[PDB]
Amino acid sequence: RFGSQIFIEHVADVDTLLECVNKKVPVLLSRGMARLVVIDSVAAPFRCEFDSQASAPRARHLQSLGATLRELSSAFQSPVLCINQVTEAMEEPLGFWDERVSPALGITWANQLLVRLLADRLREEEAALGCPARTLRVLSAPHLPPSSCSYTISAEGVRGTPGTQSH
Amino acid sequence: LDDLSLRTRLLNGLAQQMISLANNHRLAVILTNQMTTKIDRNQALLVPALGESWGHAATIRLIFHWDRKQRLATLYKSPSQKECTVLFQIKPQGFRDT
Amino acid sequence: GPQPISRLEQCGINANDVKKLEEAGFHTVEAVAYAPKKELINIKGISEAKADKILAEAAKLVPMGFTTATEFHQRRSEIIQITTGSKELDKLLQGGIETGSITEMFGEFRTGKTQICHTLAVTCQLPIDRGGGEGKAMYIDTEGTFRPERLLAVAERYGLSGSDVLDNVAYARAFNTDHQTQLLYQASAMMVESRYALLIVDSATALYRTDYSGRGELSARQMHLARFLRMLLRLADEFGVAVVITNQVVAQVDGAAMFAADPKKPIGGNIIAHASTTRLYLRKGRGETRICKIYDSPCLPEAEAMFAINADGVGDAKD
Amino acid sequence: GPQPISRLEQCGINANDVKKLEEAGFHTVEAVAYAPKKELINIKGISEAKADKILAEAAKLVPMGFTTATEFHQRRSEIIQITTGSKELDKLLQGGIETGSITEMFGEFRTGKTQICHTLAVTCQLPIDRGGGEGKAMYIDTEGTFRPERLLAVAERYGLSGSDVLDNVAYARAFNTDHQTQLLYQASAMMVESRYALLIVDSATALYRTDYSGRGELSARQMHLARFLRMLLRLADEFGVAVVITNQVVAQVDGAAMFAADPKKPIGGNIIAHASTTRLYLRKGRGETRICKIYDSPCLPEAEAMFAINADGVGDAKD
DNA sequence: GAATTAACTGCCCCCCCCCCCCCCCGTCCGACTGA
DNA sequence: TCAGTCGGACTAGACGGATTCGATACAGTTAATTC
Numbered sequence: 001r002f003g004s005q006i007f008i009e010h011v012a013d014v015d016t017l018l019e020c021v022n023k024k025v026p027v028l029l030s031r032g033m034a035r036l037v038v039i040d041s042v043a044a045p046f047r048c049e050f051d052s053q054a055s056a057p058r059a060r061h062l063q064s065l066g067a068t069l070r071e072l073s074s075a076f077q078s079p080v081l082c083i084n085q086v087t088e089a090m091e092e093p094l095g096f097w098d099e100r101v102s103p104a105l106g107i108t109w110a111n112q113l114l115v116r117l118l119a120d121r122l123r124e125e126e127a128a129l130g131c132p133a134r135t136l137r138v139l140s141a142p143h144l145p146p147s148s149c150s151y152t153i154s155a156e157g158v159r160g161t162p163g164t165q166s167h
Numbered sequence: 168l169d170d171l172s173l174r175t176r177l178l179n180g181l182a183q184q185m186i187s188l189a190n191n192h193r194l195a196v197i198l199t200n201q202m203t204t205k206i207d208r209n210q211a212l213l214v215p216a217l218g219e220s221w222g223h224a225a226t227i228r229l230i231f232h233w234d235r236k237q238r239l240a241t242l243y244k245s246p247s248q249k250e251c252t253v254l255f256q257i258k259p260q261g262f263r264d265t
Numbered sequence: 266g267p268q269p270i271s272r273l274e275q276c277g278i279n280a281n282d283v284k285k286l287e288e289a290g291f292h293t294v295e296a297v298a299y300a301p302k303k304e305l306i307n308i309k310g311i312s313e314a315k316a317d318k319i320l321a322e323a324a325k326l327v328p329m330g331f332t333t334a335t336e337f338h339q340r341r342s343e344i345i346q347i348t349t350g351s352k353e354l355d356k357l358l359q360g361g362i363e364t365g366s367i368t369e370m371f372g373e374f375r376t377g378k379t380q381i382c383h384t385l386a387v388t389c390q391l392p393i394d395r396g397g398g399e400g401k402a403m404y405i406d407t408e409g410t411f412r413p414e415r416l417l418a419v420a421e422r423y424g425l426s427g428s429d430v431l432d433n434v435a436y437a438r439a440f441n442t443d444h445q446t447q448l449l450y451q452a453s454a455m456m457v458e459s460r461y462a463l464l465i466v467d468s469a470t471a472l473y474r475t476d477y478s479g480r481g482e483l484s485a486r487q488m489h490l491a492r493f494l495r496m497l498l499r500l501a502d503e504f505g506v507a508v509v510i511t512n513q514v515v516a517q518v519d520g521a522a523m524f525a526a527d528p529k530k531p532i533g534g535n536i537i538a539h540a541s542t543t544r545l546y547l548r549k550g551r552g553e554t555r556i557c558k559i560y561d562s563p564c565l566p567e568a569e570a571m572f573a574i575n576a577d578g579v580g581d582a583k584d
Numbered sequence: 585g586p587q588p589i590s591r592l593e594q595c596g597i598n599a600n601d602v603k604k605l606e607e608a609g610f611h612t613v614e615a616v617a618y619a620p621k622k623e624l625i626n627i628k629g630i631s632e633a634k635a636d637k638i639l640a641e642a643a644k645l646v647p648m649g650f651t652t653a654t655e656f657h658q659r660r661s662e663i664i665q666i667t668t669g670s671k672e673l674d675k676l677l678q679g680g681i682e683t684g685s686i687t688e689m690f691g692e693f694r695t696g697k698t699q700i701c702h703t704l705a706v707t708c709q710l711p712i713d714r715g716g717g718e719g720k721a722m723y724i725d726t727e728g729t730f731r732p733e734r735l736l737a738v739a740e741r742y743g744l745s746g747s748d749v750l751d752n753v754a755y756a757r758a759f760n761t762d763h764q765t766q767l768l769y770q771a772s773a774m775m776v777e778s779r780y781a782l783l784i785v786d787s788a789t790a791l792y793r794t795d796y797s798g799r800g801e802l803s804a805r806q807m808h809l810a811r812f813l814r815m816l817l818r819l820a821d822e823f824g825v826a827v828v829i830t831n832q833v834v835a836q837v838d839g840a841a842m843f844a845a846d847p848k849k850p851i852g853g854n855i856i857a858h859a860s861t862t863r864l865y866l867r868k869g870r871g872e873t874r875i876c877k878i879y880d881s882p883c884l885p886e887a888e889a890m891f892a893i894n895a896d897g898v899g900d901a902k903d
Numbered sequence: 904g905a906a907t908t909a910a911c912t913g914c915c916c917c918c919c920c921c922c923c924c925c926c927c928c929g930t931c932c933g934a935c936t937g938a
Numbered sequence: 939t940c941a942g943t944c945g946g947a948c949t950a951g952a953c954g955g956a957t958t959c960g961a962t963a964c965a966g967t968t969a970a971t972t973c
């Protein structure tokens with residue numbers, strides 16, 4: 001029964017998200033309904049409240065959220081998947097030399113993670129062949145080399161292209 | 168940890184205990200730290216975290232750069248050798264040179 | 266920890282029924298508390314009375330107040346899709362434009378971003394049987410490009426009262442970003458008195474190009490746009506209306522592009538891309554015909570369609 | 585029409601603040617009301633609280649709320665349109681040049697932009713019953729091609745006194761982009777002093793071709809042009825005059841092997857493409873006959889018309 | 904003539920590959936065509 | 939009769955590149971000032 005074993009929550013503020021992860025999530029994990037946590041956009045609440053001159057409160061909130069998420073994941077052995085947005089380089093470091101885009105939320109958020117992925121799509125300039133080009137890349141991991149592959153989106157779901165992994 | 172003084176006291180005590188253990192049992196203590204952006208002048212640069220008092224709580228300090236697609240291991244503080252710069256990279260076999 | 270299924274008998278059920286529920290794949294109170302009623306009662310020999318009884322037992326035993334995907338889909342399945350006036354566009358968008366979401370159209374110059382807005386402002390008042398939304402319309406203007414005589418043509422095409430249509434479309438003009446953002450509080454106040462089915466902003470990012478200029482003012486502009494889009498999303502979620510906004514384009518003057526057919530990208534950066542749900546890309550076609558392409562959508566594949574701008578509004582290409 | 589800024593001190597504003605606003609460029613209450621808070625902050629003697637009070641008073645004086653479409657439609661129907669001197673052009677434009685919006689004309693050389701500008705400069709002084717506007721004319725010249733002999737010829741055609749017509753036209757010459765932008769404040773002062781009904785800027789983008797040469801100066805040029813267009817738009821909204829500007833063309837070197845055999849597009853880019861409300865495309869026919877085409881409009885279908893340049897000015901194609 | 908203060912400038916190095924058309928300004932005549 | 943309009947041969951067809959923009963302190967060098 002796929003439908004009845006998925007729970008959906010809505011938040012609007014950073015404080016609302018913090019309260020949700022502090023109160024509602026542990027109740028669901030402890031009783032055993034779910035063993036997977038997905039955040040649709042962690043960067044969305046933080047990009048609407050803090051400017052370039054308010055880095056310290058944002059860092060405090062990010063550290064608290066990361067600590068709470070890591071504690072819950074370690075306690076209940078449930079993977080945590082976070083979806084993030086990107087910002088351009090605006091060339092005038094962190095390992096991104098010739099990349100046009102980089103993950104958002106700075107380096108404080110990047111210190112809280114374990115495996116960092118990156119999904120990229122080449123626009124019509126490189127996608128003038130008829131179909132969009134999508135590549136899923138591994139940025140860093142304690143046990144995975146930097147690699148990449150290709151995938152397509154269809155009516156069935158996301159499927160990777162066989163014989164495409166780069167070494 | 169909102170109270171900075173408690174953190175400083177704990178860090179100093181931990182460093183003293185670790186150096187005592189190393190000298191008493193003939194060990195080689197290895198510690199790992201994190202980098203933090205500091206907006207100096209107007210061009211931000213990465214500096215080690217945990218404040219400035221912690222700076223001389225370790226006998227030897229090493230920093231790993233990124234430069235331009237090239238990993239560099241630069242010695243920072245040591246009572247035996249002058250600071251220099253050395254390149255390195257990670258292979259599927261582990262920590263290697265070249 | 267979790268409460269096993271062996272606790273139901275103390276609440277007023279016999280071993281037979283609790284076992285019947287147990288071998289049906291369920292093994293805990295938590296699973297059966299949120300189980301759908303029809304899937305609970307479809308088993309032969311299961312009566313609705315005892316089903317409601319055990320549901321009440323679970324509700325007073327299991328912590329409730331958690332939304333579920335099946336309940337989320339079966340509770341909000343009465344969404345409305347307003348027709349755009351073109352059969353090809355309705356087919357491409359699979360019925361029209363949904364409510365409770367933000368749809369943006371971006372393109373260059375003489376493409377039909379305002380004619381579509383006018384047609385939607387007229388067609389949103391049609392009865393739900395005829396493909397409308399049965400509500401009023403709100404038009405927020407930033408360029409002084411609102412023509413009631415264009416709405417009159419569509420109202421005459423669909424056989425509606427000319428004077429009634431012009432009475433259901435509230436109008437407002439924005440002169441800066443502060444005024445544009447301030448108008449949303451008045452909109453929220455107005456949406457309680459009556460029922461609205463559409464809200465049009467044209468153009469959403471027209472004033473941001475000139476109010477903030479240069480690299481120095483980029484961050485403030487982006488944050489202001491993000492706050493405005495957050496307010497729009499809150500309004501759409503609270504009142505269940507359809508929000509349609511229009512965007513502009515900027516050239517790509519670097520050598521990375523090679524197809525050389527006047528490369529262009531929408532303005533606004535990543536905030537406007539992430540905030541909006543469905544994005545459409547209109548381009549010029551032969552004669553008065555135009556081509557509409559789906560740029561981004563969570564549940565649609567990229568495709569193409571052709572429409573035309575006629576004397577009666579947006580329609581289909583003539584033969 | 586507009587209320588002079590000298591009515592703010594009656595609401596609780598010290599005279600020095602009004603004087604500072606006057607040096608700032610705001611000469612009416614409407615100008616202050618439309619301005620964002622950031623523009624008011626940049627004044628030396630005005631703080632945030634002073635700007636808040638001034639904005640509150642301006643919003644009290646000027647209505648900036650929501651309105652029914654019926655009121656807007658009724659108010660729009662009484663706007664004035666100025667005849668172009670040609671019956672075919674008037675039929676194509678459905679009355680003539682509208683007031684309160686920016687109209688742009690572009691084309692290659694000897695296509696008749698300056699002659700149309702002169703004809704509009706003369707015909708704008710006619711009584712409203714004859715297709716005029718009953719006002720004065722303002723001519724801003726950036727090339728040095730202003731000749732009062734054409735104005736005298738048109739006045740003799742229309743049976744007006746030559747001396748009076750020449751006395752009702754204001755002329756200024758712009759030598760650079762910075763000087764061109766600086767001329768839009770004295771224009772505001774003269775417009776608030778006396779009733780004007782037209783404003784010709786020819787050519788609007790002539791100096792930008794030379795002041796900014798390469799690709800490394802594109803961003804600054806586009807930002808300057810956008811600010812200039814925003815100032816033109818605020819003038820048009822505040823005083824309700826007709827704004828007519830002219831443009832130039834640039835070749836399409838890539839070609840792409842299209843049928844035109846000599847492709848060319850107007851200069852300025854997406855900024856002036858999205859800012860202009862109505863655009864006219866002029867080209868040469870045979871002898872003295874020219875062809876005008878609708879290139880962009882919110883309420884006019886794409887169509888063409890033929891006019892001619894005679895010894896009396898712009899007129900219908902003489903047989 | 905000189906000690907002394909004040910004003911204008913400056914902080915820098917990577918992109919060497921090459922399918923891609925797109926919505927007409929053709930210049931105009933032959934013939935169709937319906938009225 | 940009569941002009942607008944669909945569709946199209948008309949002697950002949952190829953060509954390539956191009957750069958900038960930030961929000962900032964202190965020294966170096968040249969210019970103004972009063973004894």
Ligand SMILES: Nc1ncnc2c1ncn2[C@@H]1O[C@H](COP(=O)(O)OP(=O)(O)OP(=O)(O)O)[C@@H](O)[C@H]1O
Binds near residue numbers: 372375378381574
């Ligand atoms: N009555 C009509 N009959 C036929 N076509 C019309 C009619 N009114 C307008 N049009 C055409 O519709 C188009 C109007 O473009 P529109 O105003 O939608 O552009 P836009 O995308 O809003 O542009 P901008 O960026 O300047 O705001 C023009 O190409 C015009 O020729």
Ligand SMILES: Nc1ncnc2c1ncn2[C@@H]1O[C@H](COP(=O)(O)OP(=O)(O)OP(=O)(O)O)[C@@H](O)[C@H]1O
Binds near residue numbers: 694872895896
């Ligand atoms: N007195 C006149 N009688 C008849 N035709 C005239 C007279 N004066 C000028 N013209 C016509 O005006 C034409 C040029 O028009 P105009 O000066 O408006 O050009 P334009 O499009 O403004 O040019 P530019 O691009 O150089 O600014 C000439 O080709 C000429 O035939």
Ligand SMILES: [Ca+2]
Binds near residue numbers: 539540541543561
């Ligand atoms: Ca989206």
Ligand SMILES: [Ca+2]
Binds near residue numbers: 860
């Ligand atoms: Ca336009």
Ligand SMILES: [Mg+2]
Binds near residue numbers: 378410
């Ligand atoms: Mg428009």
Ligand SMILES: [Mg+2]
Binds near residue numbers: 697698727729
């Ligand atoms: Mg001229």
